[PDB]
């Protein structure tokens, strides 16, 4: 043929689906304001947990010291004594 | 007074150990929040003092070392304002200043091999070895907290941590402590790569081992902001891992 008729479709394959870009716009409108909104929620967490102690991995002492109450040097004076009976 | 290699592992090995063990006893051991009040003015002291010292220096180590009483009011920072943000910051600041003091002492040594003293002694470097003197250039606008390096990204992250917690006054003070800071590391600029002395120091070549870090340490800081998210995810854990 001749230069126009192919360079006419030749750009129109170039150009893309504006539908799609219409709908990928309103998507990541969507997912980024939610997300924006979860970022603001966790920027609000306190640096000390309303926990905190109560965590297993911060008490490390309730499950330790009933296991060396027996040992030499932390009984209490009255064990001794009538431990003999 | 000490020796290169030594000062070269001080500012480093150190400080990371001794700002995780602040850490360990600010998290736990103080819940009065009296040191947020020790920490704020001797940070904001350090930052002033170190931006308006390290610019009358004529010497290279106690440049350096000014820029690490800078650079640790600038970790500091994060101290003030106790969130998980702040810690995050701090720790990445402590990271980035890490690396950048390798590769600056990496540079110090390598001109060591023909005693270097002063910072004139660095004149037309540009022309003798022009690689090294890129990378010390790169090197000092990463200290500086040029945009496109690395450094730029821990002084950013510490202001947004300093504006989270509303302490107003921290991020002023530490812009107008950048814009004097950034000065005289231009000026170490200008005497290494425009103004050529009369007389020139020839610098002899480096070994491999010290190279092979500088050019890592080199590719590091301007290609971090490329992709900067391991760190910031490294720093995010390390930060809630205080307390679960």
Redesign the interface.
């Given at each position: 043929g001749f230069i126009m008729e192919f360079a006419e479709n030749l750009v129109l394959r170039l150009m893309e689906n504006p539908e799609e870009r219409d709908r990928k716009a309103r998507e990541h409108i969507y997912e980024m304001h939610e997300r924006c909104k979860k970022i603001k929620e966790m920027?609000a967490?306190?640096?000390?947990?309303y926990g905190?102690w109560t965590?297993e991995?911060?008490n490390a002492q309730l499950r330790w010291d009933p296991q060396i109450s027996q040992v030499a040097g932390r009984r209490d004076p009255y064990d001794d004594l009538l431990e003999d009976n | 007074g000490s020796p290169t290699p030594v000062t070269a592992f001080l500012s480093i090995a150190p400080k990371i150990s001794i700002f995780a063990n602040i850490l360990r006893v600010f998290?736990y051991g103080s819940y009065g929040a009296t040191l947020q009040q020790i920490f704020f003015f001797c940070s904001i002291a350090s930052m002033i003092l170190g931006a308006l010292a390290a610019m009358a220096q004529t010497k290279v180590k106690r440049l350096l070392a000014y820029s690490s009483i800078g650079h640790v009011g600038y970790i500091c920072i994060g101290f003030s304002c106790?969130?998980?943000?702040?810690?995050q910051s701090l720790l990445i600041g402590i990271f980035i200043y890490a690396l950048m003091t390798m590769d600056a002492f990496a540079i110090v040594l390598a001109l060591r091999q023909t005693r270097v003293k002063y910072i004139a002694d660095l004149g037309a470097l540009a022309k003798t070895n022009p690689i090294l003197a890129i990378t010390f250039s790169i090197t000092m606008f990463s200290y500086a907290g040029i945009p496109p390096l690395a450094g730029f990204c821990s002084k950013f992250y510490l202001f947004f941590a300093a504006l989270?917690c509303g302490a107003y006054f921290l991020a002023l003070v530490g812009v107008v402590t950048s814009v004097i800071g950034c000065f005289y590391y231009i000026r170490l600029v200008k005497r290494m790569f425009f103004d050529t002395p009369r007389t020139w120091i020839l610098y002899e070549p480096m070994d491999r081992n010290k190279s092979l870090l500088l050019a890592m340490t080199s590719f590091f800081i301007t290609l971090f902001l490329l992709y900067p998210s391991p760190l910031f995810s490294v720093t995010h854990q390390m930060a809630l891992s205080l307390?679960?």
């Open positions: 920027w967490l306190p640096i000390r947990p905190f965590f991995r911060h | 998290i106790g969130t998980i943000e702040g810690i989270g307390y679960l």
